[PDB]
Design a protein around this ligand. Sequence first.
Ligand SMILES: CSC(=S)/C=C(\O)c1cccc(O)c1
Ligand SMILES: [Ru+3]
Length: 124
Amino acid sequence: KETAAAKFERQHMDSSTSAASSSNYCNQMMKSRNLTKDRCKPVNTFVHESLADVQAVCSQKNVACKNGQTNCYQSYSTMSITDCRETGSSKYPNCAYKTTQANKHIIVACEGNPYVPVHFDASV
Ligand SMILES: CSC(=S)/C=C(\O)c1cccc(O)c1
Ligand SMILES: [Ru+3]
């Protein structure tokens, strides 16, 4: 029932803050977005731009996806993001993450009709 498009919004959209509100950000957000459910998701990126701006990336710079598919797109403008990376001492169910804020171009995979983001591939 959760569409792929909806899952992308759950995993990767946080339009509510301009930047990572705190060294705590990742611990709180991975948990509440259900990314520490069955395992600690090792790496995950949140984007702090509007939904419209992030959906519009599917019409921007077409680039190869890390997996070799052709349906990835790089943003022309930089975007405000937060990178969440599991710590060395992190142990499920107490998943712990380092939080890093940045401004970078994002790369997303897009699929469907309508053609919308479904995976976060990379930042550059
Ligand atoms: C690491 S890629 C780099 S930083 C590229 C850009 O900023 C970029 C690329 C194409 C068009 C454009 O207008 C901007
Ligand atoms: Ru650039």
